[PDB]
Design a protein around this ligand. Structure first.
Ligand SMILES: [Fe+3]
Ligand SMILES: [Fe+3]
Ligand SMILES: [Fe+3]
Ligand SMILES: [Fe+3]
Lengths: 85, 491, 323, 491, 323, 85
């Protein structure tokens, strides 16, 4: 259930290793990624929702979809972006 | 009376003969010589433009050491190092750790050409080249040794390249690929032309001017003396490249050049760039890293390439754009991950430094400045724990540096991923990925520090475990060079 | 926190405070840190394989090759002090014997002997330079490398003397073919073929220990006794005072190479089985050295005696190392 | 193989022979040799304790210049001289002017012994001595020459001893008497033993430490290198003095020593004393002039004299007392007459300097302090014209320095006058007058600057006329070194 | 206010920016500032009188002796660079010919010739050292002094070589009396009395111009042709390769002394009457030099020819100066 | 009538050349000497009278005695001292 991804957090400068769980939703993946960027080198945006997209092809994952179902390669790079939805 | 050099010089390199008791391919194995189907006779057209002979060498080089070691001995009791700007101390600790053993390792890279080049003039110049790097490795151990009692950091002048600390791995990755694991002709091109002629020759000139600007005449004289040796052996790639181009191998020659300039640049932007734009105190900054690059490195390459019948590398325009970005990332990476290096990084983001940065790089405050804004607020507000990391950055599988780029209002960080034989690779630029795909068996089963962490090789598998794996303990682990003094300007 | 030390960490606890030689020469190779992957790249590259086979797998073995110390303690700075003085001597000989017309006083016979037996050494001396510079890049410790570094520079010194004197000889005797003919003499003259075969074969012995033995223990003593000891004595007895002195000056370099070779063999004999490993390599190469010496010295005046002396003097080098 | 020095050294000085085609007195005229009725054979007992041979000399001295000239060249662009304390600049301008041509003139003093000494070991050591002072004169011209564009003052490194400026006259008066106008044996005693062994050897050690304390490593390295030559030739008087004492000439030996130590001291207290107690900034003062004298000069003389079977000079107790006074007078004289020297004197009488002076010399404020009180009030109150003179001070006919001593509440200024053959002479101490009376024909018709002014030789016969006579013009004429900055502390 | 200059005031307006040689060597004597009272003391002291008589009143005259320039431009720094290299050559000869047993190979006859004709030169070479160091202290300009400074140091160099070889010769031939006998040979052997009389007389010629002429124009050429040219050639033909080379090395110093002497004579001939002043001094001293050369060279093998050559070679030195 | 003396002024540190006139009284000699010391390096003493004495033997000259009558050698050294009378 522990599964490594690389987090490319919006408006940060660097991609980071973030362990996530195969049972996490995307929402829970974003929170684990935020911990390493928000309030470290990126300002919160409380009017926005954090979304997860596959870096390589730009595929947007729904909030509630879980890591298990996402078809990711171990260490896959994920963009964590600010959206209205 | 004495002869004139020119009247007998050619006989010193009239040394090729036609072997008979062993074959030519046995005496010059292709994996070590890299003659590339070009004949012994065609390799004898090699003609180094800067000539020198044994008695001239030992006399001129004796006088160089007399001068450098005398300066060092006259200034040693003054203890300048104990009152130097701590960004300057850090610059030297980084320099010695990253370079001393690689200078020495170079001597072997020279020895590779001295034994295996089919060009007899290359074999003799590389014998002097071997002597030059013996000198550089030795003198760059003897100088910092004066400081071992001042702090452990100075032990890393000897120790660094014997560790798995990530900057050392990035150093060996670069040097083993350009000069230790390649055929003689490839070494002449990739090390002496691309890296020594192309970067380090002008880098040592700037470093010596900076040391004298900082008031460190020991180090100014050291760097300055070493720099005067460079061209004697740096000249060796030009003639190899002319031969390859004249004999139907321009594409192979181009490809070696493209790889070596890109890999040089990634190491240089990680270790020199931040020095110029952040460690040297504001009022000592002659020009910016980018200005240095445009004035002293880039036009010089273009002119060399033109004179050799070669092209600007495919990535040249990207490379120009990166001058505004790459090193700002490597600086922020090294400062944010400061406990993972063996010197103290200088933040360099005081109000006056940030206006200099804004003049030199319009848009800096809107981009880079954003991350530093967050970091600065945390330090003002007594949350220093949010300014050190709790994970590893992603590392490039080619350059072994963090994958980093423009943040803030113009976010542009990208990973150039590659799936290859069942494994996923990460690359910090398009050119880094390309160095891998043109020659995948040279790199395939190498693992970067992240790979090792993920495979179970670093145990305990946590940050303390990774620090021990890298040979780092308190006393050597880096921290902010001015002990956060610059935070006062923000309250 | 780690406290500052008084020396490099790898030399801490030496009792004696480390010399300049130790401070700049010890424990510098890093390819020996990971014997399974010497270089920071893929582990199957040709150069990974080359070092695994020819350095790590050598039958000449020790647990701590980094412990080796040059008995002359040479570093770059003291190398150049030393050789700058020795070249002021040699370059002074060249200058002052030229001022005296020394080359004009040689007999036609001797001039012909030089064209045959002296000047084609530019090839054999360059071959030694390639030989010792290969030892440099494949040896297991930086202190062993450095001895080979300075020995290479010496071999290039001998080439350089020979090149210079070749041009002076050509200026004085333009009809002899000095400078033009030496390649054909090295390639085709029976007096050179024993040496030519010995050094071409020795130059593809890639194992570091065998390279050390073939170049430094067997080939060099034979080359130095034939070309420096026997040709130099002959030179002096024939009125060539320049070459009798030149050869003896070059022999000082050769005695220094023998001192470090002897120290290394001493260190190797601390380990059981190494004497035998070395004796076996000596026994494979010695017959080629005998042939080299027989073909060259038999063609000299008083050939048979030159052969007897060069043979026993070159054997004596190895016997005093306990081989 | 090489011989050991000791096995053949004696043959280098087995050079005396019994002349036959000319007489011994013709070959060694007594006025040049000074053998003093002691035979050639008895002079051959001369045995220098520090031995050296030609090849050792040229090798060791080659390396000295390599080192000193390399330091100078590495530091020259940094322009330390443009930011040095101006008391330090003044110290160097004084040093070069007073000494460079006298070092060179010394070579002749060495040549006098090389030709005329009956002791063969003296003749060869003085040949090295001649070489040493050739070096000292040359290098002490080459170094200041770097500064000629900075100001005229630096031209006085060459020009001073060619002038009648009063300090130059005091310098030649001392040097011509000790070393240029005396027999070989007298030179060995009066110059090498009394002055070089006795004062300048330790003076250069202190000067080199002061230069490094001031941050001038060019000058620290220069002085320090020159100092290491001293003992090779300074040793020459000891053996001459042993021979004179063993052969019934202890009284003559004593008298030469008494004269040379006194005359040395008067020059040294005028030019070094004020430097230590007034020009070197307060926080750089290791010890006082008087402390320097007691620690490094006086006990050393007593020990030498004892080991030689000689006595403390008759004036020794007076000389001890004078350590609290003489140089304070020469300083006040040179500062008050500052337009008459070629450097800028530093007043050195700030409140903090005056408390240092009071600790080092209890009673200073009550004595010396009184004159400085008046001067300071005039500067506070805008009467700078009362701080420069309108007449000449009285000058000593022996040392050619102003006759000066304790002022204020313990007034003790005395003139040791002498009427001799119809002329009245003035002397600044009892020992100065005595040097004259023991040998009146050596000094009788010499005239000091005052004598010349009074005789009509300086025309126009006024202060402007006297300045031109001394070769002094605006631009070289001295003024307060800190431009009166220290007056602010008083308002 | 006086403006800073670009060079020393005494060299301002030279057009060419002054060399290191000019910067450290020119216009340094200050006794020539007051010809009526050279020294800053009473004007009747013996040393005042000595310089008035032997420097200022010399019949060899010029309005600006400070204009003289060494053609070799020697300063202390470049003197020692130069001589340190030349001594690495000579000291290398000593070391390496000793290693070879060179002195053991000389014949008994030649060994006896050395005891007679070679080693007693320690006295003649020291006498020249006294000779040129007197020129130093009485010459009218610092650039003239300095040439004499470095020439003195060379004369001491030749003494030192001779002292060293005397002890090596005594070690090899302890029965000959090397080191013990030379004073009696210099004092009593007719072969040395021409030289001994010449140099004892020349050493009391106090006038600077006459000292220059007697030591540098007449005595030195005669000493150098007899002891370096003729004894050195003889040495080489007799199998003494060390001395044949030593002598030729010392002759390089002597050629440099001749170059500056020739420059000074050139400068003197700018002034009417000086050629004649010099020719008159030459004519007084030349007969003593002839006697010196005749007594020494006639006692050598092939004496009469050595005399003819030394005489004409020493005359040729002065004729090429336009005397 | 111009005549040189050397002035050794009380509480000063240095002896100075002072031209005086053969017709000056001692009072006028002291005033010419004061000019070079008083208010330069010595404080006035208005309650005191300046007197002249021969340095060599300590002979006190009366105020009104003139230089002409004093038996001085040219350049003679004179103490200029503060007295009640
Ligand atoms: Fe290098
Ligand atoms: Fe290099
Ligand atoms: Fe000196
Ligand atoms: Fe001295």
């Amino acid at each position: 259930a522990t599964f490594p991804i690389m987090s490319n957090f919006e408006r940060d400068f660097v991609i980071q290793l973030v362990p996530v769980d195969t049972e996490d939703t995307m929402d829970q993946v974003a929170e684990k990624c935020a911990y390493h960027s928000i309030n470290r080198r990126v300002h919160p945006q409380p009017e926005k929702i954090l979304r997860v997209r596959r870096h390589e092809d730009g595929t947007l994952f729904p909030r509630g979809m879980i890591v298990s179902d996402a078809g990711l390669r171990p260490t896959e790079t994920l963009d964590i972006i600010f959206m209205d939805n | 009376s004495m002869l004139k050099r020119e009247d007998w010089y050619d006989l010193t390199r009239t040394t090729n003969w036609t072997p008979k008791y062993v074959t030519e391919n046995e005496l010059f194995p292709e994996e070590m010589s890299g003659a590339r189907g070009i004949s012994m006779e065609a390799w004898e057209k090699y003609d180094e433009p800067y000539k020198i002979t044994y008695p001239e060498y030992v006399s001129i080089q004796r006088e160089k050491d007399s001068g450098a070691y005398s300066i060092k001995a006259a200034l040693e009791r003054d203890g300048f190092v104990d009152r130097a700007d701590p960004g300057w101390v850090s610059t030297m600790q980084l320099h010695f750790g990253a370079i001393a053993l690689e200078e020495y390792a170079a001597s072997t890279a020279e020895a590779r050409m001295a034994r295996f080049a089919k060009a007899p003039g290359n074999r003799n110049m590389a014998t002097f080249g071997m002597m030059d790097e013996n000198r550089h490795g030795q003198i760059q151990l003897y100088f910092p040794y004066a400081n071992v009692k001042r702090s452990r950091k100075w032990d890393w002048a000897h120790k660094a390249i014997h560790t798995n600390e990530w900057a050392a791995i990035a150093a060996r990755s670069f040097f083993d690929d350009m000069m230790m694991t390649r055929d003689s002709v490839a070494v002449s091109i990739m090390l002496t032309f691309a890296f020594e002629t192309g970067f380090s020759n002008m880098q040592f000139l700037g470093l010596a001017a900076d040391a004298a600007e900082a008031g460190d005449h020991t180090f100014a004289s050291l760097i300055s003396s070493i720099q005067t040796d460079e061209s004697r052996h740096a000249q060796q790639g030009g003639p190899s490249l002319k031969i390859l181009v004249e004999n139907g191998k321009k594409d192979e020659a181009q490809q070696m050049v493209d790889v070596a300039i890109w890999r040089s640049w990634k190491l240089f932007s990680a270790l020199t760039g931040p020095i110029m734009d952040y460690y040297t105190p504001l009022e000592s900054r002659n020009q910016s890293f980018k200005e240095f690059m445009l004035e002293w490195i880039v036009a010089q390459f273009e002119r060399q390439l033109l004179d050799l019948g070669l092209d600007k590398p495919w990535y040249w325009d990207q490379f120009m754009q990166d001058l505004d970005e790459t090193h700002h990332g490597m600086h922020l990476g090294v400062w944010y991950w400061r406990p993972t290096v063996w010197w103290d990084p200088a933040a360099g983001v005081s109000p006056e430094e940030r206006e200099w940065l804004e003049e030199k790089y319009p848009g800096w405050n809107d981009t880079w400045g954003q991350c530093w804004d967050v970091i600065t607020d945390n330090l003002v507000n007594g949350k220093p724990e949010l300014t050190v990391p709790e994970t590893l950055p992603t590392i490039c599988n080619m350059c072994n540096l963090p994958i980093a780029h423009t943040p803030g209002n113009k976010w542009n960080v990208k990973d150039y991923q590659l799936e290859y034989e069942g494994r996923l690779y990460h690359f910090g630029s398009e050119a880094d990925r390309w160095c891998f795909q043109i020659d995948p068996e040279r790199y395939k089963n190498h693992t970067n520090l992240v790979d090792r962490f993920l495979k179970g090789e670093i145990q305990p598998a946590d940050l303390a475990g990774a620090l021990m794996y890298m040979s780092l303990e308190p006393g050597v682990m880096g921290d902010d060079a001015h002990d956060y003094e610059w935070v006062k300007a923000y309250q | 926190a780690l406290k500052p030390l008084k020396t490099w960490s790898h030399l801490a606890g030496n009792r004696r405070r480390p010399s300049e030689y130790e401070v700049v020469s010890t424990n510098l190779h890093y390819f020996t840190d990971n014997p399974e992957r010497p270089w920071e790249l893929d582990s199957n590259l040709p150069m990974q394989t080359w070092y695994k086979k020819y350095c790590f797998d050598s039958p000449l073995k020790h647990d701590d090759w980094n412990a080796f110390r040059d008995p002359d303690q040479l570093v770059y700075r003291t190398y150049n002090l030393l050789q700058d003085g020795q070249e002021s001597y040699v370059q002074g000989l060249f200058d002052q014997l030229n001022d005296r017309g020394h080359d004009q006083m040689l007999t036609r016979e001797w001039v012909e002997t030089l064209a045959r037996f002296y000047t084609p050494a530019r090839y054999l001396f360059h071959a030694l330079q390639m030989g010792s510079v290969y030892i440099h890049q494949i040896a297991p410790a930086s202190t062993i490398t450095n001895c080979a570094t300075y020995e290479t520079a010496d071999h290039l010194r001998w080439l350089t003397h020979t090149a210079y004197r070749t041009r002076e000889l050509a200026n004085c005797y333009p009809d002899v073919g000095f400078g033009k003919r030496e390649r054909d003499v090295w390639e085709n003259d029976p007096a050179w073929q024993g040496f030519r075969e010995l050094i071409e074969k020795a130059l593809i012995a890639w194992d570091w220990g065998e390279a050390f033995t073939a170049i430094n223990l067997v080939t060099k003593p034979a080359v130095e006794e034939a070309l420096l000891q026997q040709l130099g004595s002959l030179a002096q007895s024939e009125g060539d005072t320049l070459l009798g002195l030149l050869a003896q000056a070059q022999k000082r370099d050769a005695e220094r190479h023998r001192r470090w070779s002897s120290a290394l063999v001493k260190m190797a004999l601390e380990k059981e089985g190494n004497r035998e490993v070395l004796q076996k390599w000596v026994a494979k190469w010695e017959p080629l050295a005998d042939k080299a010496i027989e073909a060259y010295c038999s063609a000299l005046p008083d050939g048979e005696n030159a052969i007897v002396e060069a043979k026993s003097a070159s054997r004596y080098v190895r016997q005093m190392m306990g081989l």
